[PDB]
Amino acid sequence: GSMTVYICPETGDDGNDGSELKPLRTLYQAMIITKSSKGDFLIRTKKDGKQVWEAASKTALKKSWKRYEQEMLKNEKVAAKMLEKDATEVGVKAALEEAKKVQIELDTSLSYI
């Protein structure tokens, strides 16, 4: 479990799925999709000229979640898009029964005749 959300304020977008390929542009949305808050959130930073993923800090996380409170606690009409992909499993078996005959020999001799 624990969905890692990737944030690129630079080249991603707040409306994405928050993957490494589709990074979010806000840490706030990372918290929305997962609602894990203290989960693993990685934000791309450019360190020594290279873009790397750095783990979000509790300070930045709470800074993002503080706003989550504001909109979600009061519950305004902004629509917090999470969306699940799919978890639908199908299955059906065919019902049938065996049908055989049996021989039943009876005397039918009549003991009282």
Side-chain angles (χ1 to χ4, degrees):
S2 302
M3 177 182 179
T4 298
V5 191
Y6 300 87
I7 304 60
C8 295
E10 51 184 89
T11 56
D13 186 84
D14 186 83
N16 294 332
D17 297 273
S19 57
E20 181 181 71
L21 301 309
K22 309 174 177 299
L24 298 176
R25 68 73 171 154
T26 320
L27 181 57
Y28 181 90
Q29 179 60 30
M31 283 182 168
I32 299 181
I33 303 180
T34 60
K35 191 180 296 186
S36 304
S37 305
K38 58 183 61 175
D40 183 54
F41 304 107
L42 305 181
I43 305 188
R44 198 169 79 175
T45 186
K46 292 74 71 180
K47 186 174 292 179
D48 187 63
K50 292 182 58 181
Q51 59 294 329
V52 294
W53 297 111
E54 185 178 271
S57 184
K58 298 175 64 178
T59 54
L61 290 168
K62 297 178 182 179
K63 168 276 187 174
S64 303
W65 184 263
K66 189 289 183 178
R67 188 175 299 208
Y68 193 111
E69 300 293 86
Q70 300 183 270
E71 304 194 297
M72 302 301 298
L73 182 62
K74 292 65 180 301
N75 181 87
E76 305 186 283
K77 305 178 184 300
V78 184
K81 183 178 62 178
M82 301 177 63
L83 297 180
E84 57 183 79
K85 302 302 180 184
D86 178 272
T88 60
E89 62 296 276
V90 298
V92 62
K93 303 301 180 300
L96 68 174
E97 59 181 74
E98 175 62 284
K100 296 296 177 58
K101 295 70 185 303
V102 60
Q103 299 296 29
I104 54 178
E105 292 64 77
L106 302 180
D107 292 85
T108 59
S109 183
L110 290 303
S111 304
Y112 177 77
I113 178 175

